[PDB]
Design a protein around this ligand. Structure first.
Ligand SMILES: C/C=C/Cn1cc(-c2cccc(C(=O)N(C)C)c2)c2cc[nH]c2c1=O
Length: 101
């Protein structure tokens, strides 16, 4: 609806294209990642970001960028550097921030 919502939906679509496996698509469960909720205090994922856009909870691109960075930082905190997850998070973090200027 609103201009910011339209822009953030556009950014979100482009970011999700960089995650074809959808590792970032939904909240990480402790079943898939043992101990996750005990290690990551502020979980974030593309699905939650979509819900926040729809609810009109972002009022600036800066806020959206902060949630995107949080999501990537979480993946680089929980996962070791040699994992596909860590490597994807670092790659998408830089590409996403460039893509968003
Ligand atoms: C780039 C990752 C972002 C978030 N994330 C997602 C998964 C995840 C989620 C859903 C499915 C799978 C998967 O395909 N597995 C576990 C085989 C992984 C996972 C598993 C261990 N750590 C993580 C993780 O940090």
């Amino acid at each position: 609806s609103t201009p910011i919502q339209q822009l953030l939906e556009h950014f979100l679509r482009q970011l999700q294209r960089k995650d074809p496996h959808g590792f970032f698509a939904f909240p990480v469960t402790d079943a898939i990642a043992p101990g996750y909720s005990m290690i990551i205090k502020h979980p974030m994922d593309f699905g939650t970001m979509k819900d926040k856009i729809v609810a009109n909870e972002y009022k600036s691109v800066t806020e959206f960028k902060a949630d995107f960075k949080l999501m990537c930082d979480n993946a680089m905190t929980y996962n070791r550097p040699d994992t596909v997850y860590y490597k994807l998070a670092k790659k998408i973090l830089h590409a996403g921030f460039k893509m968003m200027s």
